[PDB]
Amino acid sequence: EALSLKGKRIGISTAGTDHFFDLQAYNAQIAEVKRLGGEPLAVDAGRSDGKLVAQLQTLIAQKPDAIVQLLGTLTVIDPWLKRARDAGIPVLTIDVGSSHSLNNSTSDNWGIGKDLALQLVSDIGGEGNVVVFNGFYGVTPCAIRYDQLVNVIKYFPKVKIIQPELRDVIPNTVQDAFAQVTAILNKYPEKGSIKAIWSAWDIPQLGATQALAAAGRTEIKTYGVDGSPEVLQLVADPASPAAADVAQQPAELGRQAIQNVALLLSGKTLPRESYVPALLANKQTVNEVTRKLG
Ligand SMILES: OC[C@@H](O)[C@@H](O)[C@@H](O)[C@@H](O)CO
Ligand SMILES: [Cl-]
Numbered sequence: 168e169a170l171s172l173k174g175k176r177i178g179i180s181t182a183g184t185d186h187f188f189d190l191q192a193y194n195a196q197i198a199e200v201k202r203l204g205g206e207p208l209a210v211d212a213g214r215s216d217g218k219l220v221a222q223l224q225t226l227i228a229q230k231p232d233a234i235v236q237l238l239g240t241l242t243v244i245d246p247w248l249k250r251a252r253d254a255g256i257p258v259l260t261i262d263v264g265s266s267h268s269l270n271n272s273t274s275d276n277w278g279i280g281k282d283l284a285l286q287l288v289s290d291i292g293g294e295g296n297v298v299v300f301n302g303f304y305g306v307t308p309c310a311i312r313y314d315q316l317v318n319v320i321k322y323f324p325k326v327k328i329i330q331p332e333l334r335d336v337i338p339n340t341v342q343d344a345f346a347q348v349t350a351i352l353n354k355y356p357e358k359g360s361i362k363a364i365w366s367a368w369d370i371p372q373l374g375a376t377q378a379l380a381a382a383g384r385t386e387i388k389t390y391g392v393d394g395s396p397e398v399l400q401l402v403a404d405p406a407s408p409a410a411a412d413v414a415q416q417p418a419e420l421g422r423q424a425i426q427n428v429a430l431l432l433s434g435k436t437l438p439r440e441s442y443v444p445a446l447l448a449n450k451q452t453v454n455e456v457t458r459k460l461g
Contacts (some may be wrong), residue, residue: 169230172205172428177428178226178234178256179207182244185338186370188417192237192261195421198274203429205232214337216243220231223247233257233428240305241265244366257431259422262305270437274423276308279392279413280315283448286411287316287363294325295362296350300344300371302334309367312392316365329361334406335371342376345381352382361387369393369412376401376409384408385412394448395458403453411449414456419443 184190193211200207212219219239226234234251237243243261248258248267260268269344280443287297297318302310320326333351336343348364356363357447364375364387372391376398379387385408391398394414401409420443427437448456 168433169181170203170426170433172200172203172429172432173423175205175233175432176231176234177205177207177425178227178229178231179209179237180212180219180222180226180234180235182212182239182385184211185214186229186340186377186394187397188368188415189238191433192212192421193440194383194453195418196235196237196261196361196425199425200428212239216240216428219349222248225250227251227254227256230256232261232432235261235422235424235428236263236268238306239263240303241307242305250407257428258430259437260304262308262419264344264440269431269439270424270427271307271440272427273308273440273442274415274420275442277315279415279445280310280312281319283312283314283365283390283392283411283413284319284446286449287365287388288319288326290388290410291326293323296329296355296360298328298348298361298364298375299328299332299366300335300347300366300375301332302336302371303367312367320446321444321447329355329393335366341374341377344371347380348349348368348375348378349382352378358384358386363387364389366391368428369395369398372409372412373398373401376407384458390447394446394456399448399453401449402450403457405450411447414446414448414451416443416445416460
């Protein structure tokens, strides 16, 4: 029969909503629970680990029909996802590869990370130095994306990751990424001594790209993931060093998660992960990518 959540209460917990991917996935879950007739209990951690734990505890005390957790550092949330299951509460996730989740809605990040890395390598001629932002390695999709970069360049050994990897941050992501790249360009002033800057998601990319323009170092190419509109439009600008951004579908991911909650409560067994396609946008493909998202 048609899916429904009538009479159900669904806990919806996100690590934050402070940029495109997170806001989209969060809102679309809330929307979808409502559209299926369920009652969402939606809690935003504002990117505090303390608030994230505290709101999951409260959702647990509420004994909703399911909890969906969006993003977060796996070691931070895992004890609470376990507690929820132990309390009798079905747990699903978005971008969290937990043993305690019944189903993780996520892009196929092996595909994403490999595709981005191969683009990067091809773009720089198989040779040169790469500045890497790797500040969210504790977050499943970012860990996978980083692992794939490492693994792709392993087989193109004239490609090197510059040492001290940088740590991107949230919030203040753009201003911080701008400052870090600005300071690193001053360590490596010689044209050609950096060829790319990689990030696991595209808001640090945005900071990076800006710092390149400001510094007069646009020979350097930038790379990222999410397809936030503000960054896609940089990729589309020939005069921008933003070279590639793998677009994700966060509203689709959020709807899928809730679709999968309904399926679970109706009795069906879920696959452990459910992959939503992603689309690599480079300077040639961004138009057809941007159009498929709008
Ligand atoms: O954990 C940071 C970041 O990767 C996420 O907030 C989001 O932007 C997506 O890239 C996750 O699929
Ligand atoms: Cl320039």
